[PDB]
Amino acid sequence: AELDDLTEKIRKAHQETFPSLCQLGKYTTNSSADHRVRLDLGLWDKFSELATKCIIKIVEFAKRLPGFTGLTIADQITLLKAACLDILILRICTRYTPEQDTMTFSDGLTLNRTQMHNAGFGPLTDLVFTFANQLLPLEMDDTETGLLSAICLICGDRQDLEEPTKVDKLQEPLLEALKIYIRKRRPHMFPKILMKITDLRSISAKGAERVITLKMEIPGSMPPLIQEMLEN
Template identity: 30%
Template sequence: MSRDSVRYGRVPKRSREKGDDNRVTTSGAEPTETIFNEMQLATFEMIVTLSQAHYAHCSYTEEKTRGIMRKPAIFTSMDEYGSPQSDCSPTSVTADSLEQQKINMWQRFADFITPSISRVVEYAKRIPGFLELSQDDQLILIKSGFFEIWLVHVSKMFDPIDNTLTFSDGNFITRQQMELMFDHEFVSSIFNFMIGFNQLHLHDIEIGIFAAIALCCPDRYGVYDAKAIHRIEEKLYEAMKIQSARTRGFDSRYHENVVVKVPELRAIGIKHAEHLSWFRGNWTRLKLPPLFAEIFDIPKSEDELLLVAQ
């Protein structure tokens, strides 16, 4: 854990004590000043909470990814007896095998992503104000925002030299393999986002805040209380501004560069949702982890899973 996060774990108590002293000794303080100090403390505590949640539930922190042993992901097809056939590499693609290879790759890709789902759910519960939303709104935000949050987390594992993306267990997938699953345009948008996002050089704490911003979008289709979500979103943006100013000095242009990545990320999320229509049309041919099927609303025979605990 970084020094910043260690300091964050200690300061709120002192700040709270200082705030208590101020209320006793500065009875003549202006009400607006008191309100401002309380808002600052609330924002500071939000940063602490998000930092702790990020370190606890993200598999792609600086510490956790240090020293990962990379290995190429193996995508194998099965014959009628369930035995592995040849590796599903793009060089072996033919017109007859393309559809089956795409299915095999989707299934393996789902296996790689699924462990992050429960982690994102647990992280979301720690976002101040999130559990105060209706359970329906919580589910909508998690389901519609999961892929975007996962991209934020995994971005640091993108290698622009060999065009590979490495998962938390060390398996990596190539650009060609991803294009076989999706298409060239969509994969280009993902990699371009990752390049730009990595150029911001966000620290783990800032990534934790950014992920919360990505999740708490009041414009998600179907949400009931958009105003409540918007209030959380505003607080998260303020937290990002304060944290960025603390670590690198306030730079309005830098802050704007961070903010503009949000709509870019959401555009990718919308495109990903469109690709899921292929999933839903071929669900009878897929063997997906139940939690993966649940998060993306893909039909399955298993009972529905509850992502957010009562």
């Protein structure tokens, strides 16, 4: 009952900070829609702008997680910076429309693969779409996506944690919660969803070089929160 209570709370934290694809008004753009280019600055400006907003929403999601507030701000910051890209990647991949081969952002902006590539994903584009495509068969809902996000976040083995053991105990209930929910809702889903964390980490790891490359390409400055996120 306390685990059913935790599950409902995580689902809510997610739903409140992440607009569903079905509850969003999709809109497109014709900017470099059919030709891949190094970087479309107009798409980068819009994309990076939305990235900043989503990062803020991720911090809000984290704050809504039971116990997170309890940890020290130092630990809150370490956990967030280590898992933010993972979560940003999972979020955009959850708004993938296979028929149109597009992904939709929080404000309804819907870009095709080419535009995703041109907005900044570059050489990581196909890798991201493949992750999104492999996500579909799992048919996950708000609570599973939220529990997965929380599992990516609450990791007590992150380096520089002031209270690693306290973090471990906060994640302990998460795996069980997910275990139980998966079997109560749609009766091998447990390990398949968990394996995705690895795929996720693998992709976010490629972000370190990507940001350096983008910085070298843009005429302006890298948005402060993105900077802070990969600044480590």
